[PDB]
Amino acid sequence: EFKAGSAKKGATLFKTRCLQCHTVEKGGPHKVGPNLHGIFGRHSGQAEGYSYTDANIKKNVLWDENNMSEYLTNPKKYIPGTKMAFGGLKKEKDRNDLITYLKKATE
Amino acid sequence: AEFKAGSAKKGATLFKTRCLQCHTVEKGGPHKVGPNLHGIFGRHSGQAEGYSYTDANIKKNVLWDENNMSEYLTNPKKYIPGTKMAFGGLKKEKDRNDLITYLKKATE
Numbered sequence: 001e002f003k004a005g006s007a008k009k010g011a012t013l014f015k016t017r018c019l020q021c022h023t024v025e026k027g028g029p030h031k032v033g034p035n036l037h038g039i040f041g042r043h044s045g046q047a048e049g050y051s052y053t054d055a056n057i058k059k060n061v062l063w064d065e066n067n068m069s070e071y072l073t074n075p076k077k078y079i080p081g082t083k084m085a086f087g088g089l090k091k092e093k094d095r096n097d098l099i100t101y102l103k104k105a106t107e
Numbered sequence: 108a109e110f111k112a113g114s115a116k117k118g119a120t121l122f123k124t125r126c127l128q129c130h131t132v133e134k135g136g137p138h139k140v141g142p143n144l145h146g147i148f149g150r151h152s153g154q155a156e157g158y159s160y161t162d163a164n165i166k167k168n169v170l171w172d173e174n175n176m177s178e179y180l181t182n183p184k185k186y187i188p189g190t191k192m193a194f195g196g197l198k199k200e201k202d203r204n205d206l207i208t209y210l211k212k213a214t215e
């Protein structure tokens with residue numbers, strides 16, 4: 001399960017693996033992927049001004065640290081049909097660190 | 108609600124004293140007052156066949172996990188208004204953590 005880690009390590013992971021497609025700040029733009037401000041406690045597929053797959057929408061995930069960790073392990077396994085082109089983060093430590101960063105960066 | 112892994116030993120005792128009267132956990136275990144909970148952490152609410160749910164539980168369509176289960180068990184009728192699960196709730200985070208640690212193992 002998710003355990004608080006290092007947002008410092010997390011930020012580097014996010015920057016090298018996610019930032020290309022996602023911004024995190026309030027009012028930051030949608031790009032290849034949606035802006036993630038407020039993602040934790042929001043349902044999947046709900047950010048306005050972004051065109052999602054029906055798959056992402058229908059999943060009805062209420063994003064939290066634990067289901068995010070499962071998603072990021074292997075996105076297409078968690079949401080078959082998703083257009084997020086990301087293989088996954090296999091190490092629990094990396095997901096813990098990334099998610100620690102993301103919670104703080106998107107709140 | 109935050110979840111932290113706890114004691115399944117303590118969780119099992121919580122399950123026996125607070126849940127077992129209405130629920131089974133094992134694969135193929137019977138529906139009773141409440142539905143069998145095998146596989147609950149891989150599906151949405153209201154989806155076990157052979158059990159008659161409220162519309163409220165079905166409509167909620169919650170994708171159960173540790174965090175939202177913890178929120179639900181704090182106060183079920185608040186989380187799913189109109190649910191017929193007659194359970195007041197587990198007010199202490201430690202108890203929820205322990206129970207959910209047990210449930211993850213017992214229902215897998």
Ligand code: HEC
Binds near residue numbers: 046
């Ligand atoms: C493009 C090459 C991306 C990279 C790299 C990552 N993500 Fe992504 N993500 C992308 C798209 C196109 C989408 C929408 C998918 C769909 O099927 O519609 C997403 C979606 C997410 C989500 C869910 C957002 C929501 O429901 O509002 C999350 C939480 C997310 N992505 C996170 C994320 C992280 C943390 C990344 C690096 C580890 C990452 N993504 C990479 C496109 C791309």
Ligand code: HEC
Binds near residue numbers: 122127151191197
């Ligand atoms: C009867 C007196 C119950 C007790 C005690 C507990 N539960 Fe229950 N639960 C009960 C019913 C009748 C229902 C169906 C509710 C409806 O509105 O249709 C439920 C439902 C659940 C669920 C959702 C299951 C699903 O969506 O498939 C869960 C996860 C659940 N119950 C768990 C649970 C736990 C952990 C309990 C003790 C702490 C517990 N319940 C007590 C009836 C009763």
